[PDB]
Design an enzyme around this catalytic site. Structure first.
Site, short mmCIF file in Angstrom:
data_model
loop_
_atom_site.label_atom_id
_atom_site.label_comp_id
_atom_site.label_asym_id
_atom_site.label_seq_id
_atom_site.Cartn_x
_atom_site.Cartn_y
_atom_site.Cartn_z
N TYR A 119 60.75 -20.20 1.70
CA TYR A 119 59.49 -19.98 1.00
C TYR A 119 59.61 -18.76 0.10
O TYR A 119 59.08 -18.73 -0.99
CB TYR A 119 58.40 -19.83 2.05
CG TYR A 119 58.08 -21.06 2.83
CD1 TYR A 119 57.82 -22.27 2.22
CD2 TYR A 119 58.01 -21.01 4.19
CE1 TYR A 119 57.51 -23.40 2.96
CE2 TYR A 119 57.70 -22.10 4.95
CZ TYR A 119 57.46 -23.30 4.33
OH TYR A 119 57.17 -24.35 5.14
N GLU A 120 60.30 -17.72 0.55
CA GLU A 120 60.60 -16.58 -0.28
C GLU A 120 61.38 -16.98 -1.53
O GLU A 120 61.07 -16.52 -2.64
CB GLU A 120 61.40 -15.49 0.48
CG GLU A 120 60.51 -14.43 1.07
CD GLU A 120 61.17 -13.47 2.08
OE1 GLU A 120 62.38 -13.49 2.26
OE2 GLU A 120 60.42 -12.65 2.67
N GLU A 146 42.97 -42.84 16.70
CA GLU A 146 42.12 -41.71 16.34
C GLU A 146 42.37 -41.36 14.88
O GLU A 146 41.43 -41.16 14.11
CB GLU A 146 42.42 -40.47 17.21
CG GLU A 146 42.00 -40.56 18.67
CD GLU A 146 42.36 -39.32 19.49
OE1 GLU A 146 41.45 -38.47 19.71
OE2 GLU A 146 43.54 -39.17 19.91
N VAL A 202 61.31 -19.11 6.48
CA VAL A 202 60.91 -17.90 5.75
C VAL A 202 61.72 -17.69 4.49
O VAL A 202 61.21 -17.43 3.41
CB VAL A 202 60.96 -16.64 6.62
CG1 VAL A 202 60.58 -15.39 5.80
CG2 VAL A 202 59.97 -16.76 7.80
N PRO A 246 63.35 -18.04 10.86
CA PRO A 246 63.72 -17.27 9.66
C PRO A 246 64.30 -18.15 8.49
O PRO A 246 64.28 -17.75 7.33
CB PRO A 246 64.79 -16.30 10.19
CG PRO A 246 65.31 -16.96 11.46
CD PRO A 246 64.06 -17.54 12.06
N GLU A 283 40.26 -30.70 10.93
CA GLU A 283 39.95 -29.78 12.08
C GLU A 283 39.51 -30.46 13.35
O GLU A 283 39.04 -29.82 14.28
CB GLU A 283 39.00 -28.62 11.65
CG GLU A 283 39.42 -27.92 10.36
CD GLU A 283 38.51 -26.73 9.96
OE1 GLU A 283 38.47 -25.74 10.69
OE2 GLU A 283 37.86 -26.75 8.88
N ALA A 296 63.38 -29.87 0.52
CA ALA A 296 62.23 -28.97 0.79
C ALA A 296 61.83 -28.17 -0.44
O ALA A 296 60.66 -27.94 -0.65
CB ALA A 296 62.50 -28.04 1.98
N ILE A 355 54.09 -28.40 4.70
CA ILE A 355 54.90 -29.54 4.38
C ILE A 355 55.70 -29.88 5.61
O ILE A 355 56.03 -29.01 6.40
CB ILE A 355 55.74 -29.27 3.12
CG1 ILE A 355 57.14 -28.82 3.44
CG2 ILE A 355 55.10 -28.19 2.26
CD1 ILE A 355 58.12 -29.90 3.08
NA NA Z 1 39.60 -38.21 24.11
#
Ligand code: NA
Ligand code: NA
Ligand code: NA
Ligand code: NA
Ligand code: NA
Ligand code: NA
Ligand code: NA
Ligand code: NA
Ligand code: NA
Ligand code: NA
Ligand code: NA
Ligand code: NA
Lengths: 170, 169, 170, 170, 169, 170, 170, 170, 169, 169, 170, 170
Positions: G131-132, G38, G128, G125, G30, G96, G84
């Protein structure tokens, strides 16, 4: 009527008092100290260190009778060195036997140690007699082992084993 | 009994917890560190305050008398299991509280913590406690041989368990 | 109801926060760390005092009774969204304060924090709460299946949102 | 009869009160804060940081009248941004001129800055008038610079130089 | 005057020191860090408590009234020199104390600290002070041009010094 | 005079220690760090609480008046030597306590610390102090030239010693 | 022929490459990041944090095919968010499905999670549909949830439960 | 010109950054700390690696020559603004890359960072730079008087802005 | 077999240990912290290097091929008990090594560490291993119900133990 | 000379700086801490890398030969003053470089750092240097008596200064 | 045999130290912390580098083969005692080096460390070791019962000592 | 042809070699050490400590001839203790005079010390003669001051003052 309990920080003044009238340097976890301030800082520094365990014996009215100390605790060989000190105002009132049994009881029935040993000055035959009565046996007569009151003194090393203590009435 | 409440342990409860110890002839532990003094207990408390391997609760009555301690230890969040113990203070034993205490603990474990399994150890030489746990739905899954050194000898204990699916159904 | 004021949470409000939890059958969290005790809460508070991912406010009346809590969590400053929750103390439920707290929280979120979207979760098996939020301009965008383990079972929750553009043009 | 003195930790409650009734986020050393607790921790964290300097103006009876803040202080270009806030109960009693002069005096005769600038809402022509009376001149009309009360607002940037202030009567 | 005592600065003296500042139209420094508030002064005090580059003393009378401050800064222990300043609180100026204060400072510098040279700065626009220092054996060694920004302009100062061999002989 | 007791220095004795210095025209040291203020002293105390190169003791009477200070510094545990100094508070000088403090300090050094040699410095221009130490068994081993800068000039000091073997056979 | 393994520090360059061609900010625990530097520092900082777990899928010749990430892991509710990414050169080669099954297998048979959910752009789509096919079901259509390529976009939230996955053939 | 790519700054680019400064007669800053040496820069880089108030990117060509630097500083996530600067290496000035870098920086700022406003400073005595920015949609909002000490004198600068709404509707 | 040696785990052995994991369908732990990557394992190794709750050994043959891992965990020095596990690498299973490995571990536990009791868990669905342990003197003391989540379901395990007095006599 | 460049000191320049010392019969300082060894210099360098009280530059020619060192110390940003020193390495003295070095330093001080006043010390027993500084616009403002212990005696120095308004006009 | 030299232990000798242990059926210790691995040993070494309670030396021949180790532990500087042990590498046992190492260790202990007493432990069931020590002037002062758990059972050990006075007058 | 230069870390092996053949314990800032490892760690720990200063004397071909050490440096009394050691292969080649003059020159003309003193064994009349030739004078004959090769030895303390050294030819 005497009870054994773990040492707490509020008992440190008593401990320090007990060392006051002794003709040998005092240690906490093998660090020497003279002042109450040192003692308190050493206490805090070693609070989680399992190499030494200390207990105070109190009467029914919560008067501190004495100190029981286990040091050099080793958890492979399951041995430790024991010392007890009784406050001067409570000496000769037959409490030393009680303190020794309480320490042996704790050592052998809770801490599960195999061997407890102690040193006693050769020049203290009264204390030798007490420890012998309580099942300790001489295993060493150590020569000029400690400098005590201006001269190297001899001490008896005396021991008792868990198997003796726990089974000797069986 | 319906008056008994379970709450999380707090720092002002450590005196009570420490008193519950000096009667027991086994070493006491906090997050698997042994301790003997109140001072040690307090530092251990502070050091593990965020550690989720163990959770503790105290039970009070209506007048805020401390009745006992509920302890979950060895908490594992993959296998969803914990080891449970309860201690009831002297002056409140023999008052028909134990069942309620066990029920509050199971309730918390299974309705809030979402554990799958709770297990406990009881001394073989303590048959009345075995019976009690049995009444609360625990069943023996082991008889551990010479498991703990207690008061001068190695003693056997029963390991008893109960599952979430059983408790909730 | 305009006698209610919203202020930032302070360390002296943590007792109240903690009390609000004892009445809920779900684990409580502070910056996504679960906690059960006041001691825990107080350390988590200290640990996260400068963390801007969550912000909290307490609502008081003119006589300074603590009415409830508004929490904004999962605050994201790129997408400009946050999850919102309110909790009203038991003794002040049903008094008609909830609509006011909601409006205060929305006003803050949209006029001072400059957020784009606020969303919340509500239990599907809590329909009158669903009704309150609708009246305050929230709309369902999800029905999340077996989302949270609450009181012995996995429960479904509605996700409900409102946007800054809609709120500021009321 | 008004005196300017450095901000001290016991003045933080006053500062926090002053920010309470403002429709923009508050910062301490560019870190945003809402609570008194945050403010106090930020105060302690930045106590030696020379990028911002704050002062409180007190009357003869030690009532706090207002805050003078210098932020973005740069010691190569010798510039800083100035803001003042007067406590609501002391507004409109002609103290704002005094506070502005005290801050300019300190900036220019002790801190040896070359330039002081400030922002004022375009929608606040009364404050524009005050700063102009005290020798500030518009150098910018910044467009949609701050989000304030639900909408991006324009602000005037206004400045005064040390050489103007110190020599304009010579 | 024989009643005036010099002692080391202590933490309970910082309020006095801070008050001695708000009257001066120059920035104040502690170990060459500028400060404005009491809070800053206290943290600077704690941070430099062991630093031997600067030493401070306060002078009290018999009733423990605080009379003034003696400050040695830029202390160098190879060249054995320090820069000296004294401030006398308002309510005790014009009482013929300055000479005694200067004498106690020189005494300490030369009889205990074993410094070789002490120097000070005085504003050119402050002739009465120059005269005073002159009476205590200081001599001008520099006229520093536009050295310090004070109350809105760069001002010249005299640098005056006295040596240990002169003071002690 | 046997009513005087020697105890380890404690943090509550530092005010007395500090007072003893204000009467001396020589820089004072704690573990070889110079200090002038009580604040300094207290931090140096804390910093060196576990350092065994110096040990200090205060002498009190039966009514607990602080009589003086015994300091052992430059303690070396291979060569078994230390430098000793005493200082008696002004108000108790000349009362005949110095010989007693010396004997206590020697007894400690030689019977508990098991040191081999104790030495001291005394001003050459302090002949009655030289006389006191001789009476207590010290002997000159050096006359150190321009050793210490004291009160405006470099002064000569006698170094005087005593050995453990001589002391313990008195 | 594809294998799933825990992410290691030597895989970070691959990860960073994968984020390169994306029109949304990237996060690690997060915290947003853009640079490799970084990312590496964040990796080290969160190495023991159990809130996120990442895995790389490799072929037989150790070519990195893709990343499987589980974030927002909660061990009371036993849920986590899954994403993923497949490296551009390996897209459209039917990998996939394999990656999704490997992640579901690990989630449900080793980590013992109860629920896995993901977000997919409404404007995607094709994903979508994938995953379905793999047992995900829409539980939410989140409105203007993310700012992506210059505009707030809608996303589908889609989920699968452990009990479905493990028992659906039984 | 579409062969130019924008990437995040990395520690191996600091030599280039430092080289770009030696050609400028103004103090350089990193997160508002002034610096002159590469050593300084490298420590400042490390110190601020997680600080989101400034972001930097380097532009490279297809052959990986370092073309220039884009910096966003004073980034504020409430008001959603930032100050922008570009610097093109001497050897690549005048080649027609500046317009491209500007567009890349704007695209990032407005489509990924979701900023509302970007502003810049340009020297008043740099009119052809003023012209470039106008062509790229910037408009003057200030003429800041004696703002920066550059090469021996205080210089005036134009402040020039562009908004997200204008850019995204081009 | 007489050629097999047991030595303490060292940091250069963690690659081997990590490889022994990726074949197992249960989470791996180091001092009760779960881990998945080599990087995590290495940091956990360093963090617990002085912790005596767990001890690990690797077995090598004559050519320094790594044969397997011996692990003692939950080591308690009051009760003198530990939980023991052994893993043998793939390419060395089915070579009649297991017995020797178990014997070296028991030897170390009982002749050097001076433990009183060693216990292990074995899957109920793994009868050949139960038999093996039985031949080395282990006996069942529990059948733990739904104890561990392994490959998609909660599985039962046997808890088996052996005591020091039995092994040494 | 137009070929001479001034750049900021870097860590690889400390060997040069340290060599410039061993020829001088006065103690060397870094941020007012004395030092003798290269090792000390390097640790002092690292410790004060962010401290803006002192700034250093080295001058190189076209072939990157190190010509000398420019040092600004006692930098005060309220009074806008600094003390300046320059050292030219042995093998480059007597080449008519000094003037250029002084000019680059003044340029930096007054055109970039925006200082108001720069001052320097020169030994009274060094008249040729006084003359040189005079040619670059420096003027004597003090004759400091027995200011520094140098090669076995306390020596007098001239304090010379130049102002920004003079240099820039 | 006068070609053997005693030097202080160094970090590059720890591999040899560790090798010497693998041949012993007793737990090894470093400053009373037990260890089994080289990694442990190396960290314990680092941790105790300044601790004077134990000192170690390695003996090498003229060709720099590592012959053995001399360890002094439980060193006490008041009572001036220490426990001594030697260990000779397997490949150099029986070559007649032990007497030489003993003499070197005694010489160091008594002429440089200025110790008063050296003691050692030897197994009672190791009589030829007992014989070696007697020949080197050691005398039995204890027979310690069940002192150490070695190779499956508690074993008895002789404690044997020698004094400085006896050694230095040989 | 000999030059004096500050000690550097690369000289530590030489230093350690020099201490090797000495029958007294070695110290660095009053901490005893035997190993190269200890020495290196002590070196790093005391790098900024001004209480001791060390220098090595090298010939034209950069062979290390000897060590000059100043310890117990006190900057109020302006005194220090001096020792020199010459490497065995360079003894008796008349370099000791040169080293002593270089150290005196540095002490008195750069460090501005007032007094330098040293100890020399009474049983070393050759070294006594050397120091006397170089202007040192006996100020003490210290009795049983150091334990050296199995017995307490006497040492001469000898001194020279700055005023003597600098003016004795004037
Ligand atoms: Na910065
Ligand atoms: Na302990
Ligand atoms: Na916990
Ligand atoms: Na926050
Ligand atoms: Na500040
Ligand atoms: Na100081
Ligand atoms: Na001490
Ligand atoms: Na993780
Ligand atoms: Na371990
Ligand atoms: Na600097
Ligand atoms: Na040691
Ligand atoms: Na030094």
């Amino acid at each position: 009527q005497l009870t054994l309990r773990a040492l707490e920080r509020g008992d440190l003044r008593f401990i320090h008092n007990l060392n006051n009238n002794r003709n040998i340097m005092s240690y906490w976890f093998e660090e020497p100290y003279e002042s109450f301030d040192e003692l308190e800082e050493l206490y805090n520094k070693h609070i989680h260190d399992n190499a030494e365990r200390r207990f105070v014996v109190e009467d029914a009215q919560k008067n501190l009778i004495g100190l029981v100390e286990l040091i050099e605790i080793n958890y492979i060989h399951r041995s430790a060195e024991f010392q007890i000190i009784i406050a001067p105002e409570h000496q000769g009132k037959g409490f030393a036997r009680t303190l020794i049994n309480r320490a042996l009881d704790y050592s052998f029935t809770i801490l599960n140690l195999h061997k407890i040993y102690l040193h006693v000055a050769v020049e203290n035959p009264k204390a030798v007699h007490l420890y012998e009565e309580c099942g300790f046996v001489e295993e060493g007569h150590l020569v000029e082992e400690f400098f005590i009151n201006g001269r190297y003194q001899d001490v008896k090393r005396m021991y008792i084993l868990q198997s003796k203590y726990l089974n000797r009435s069986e």
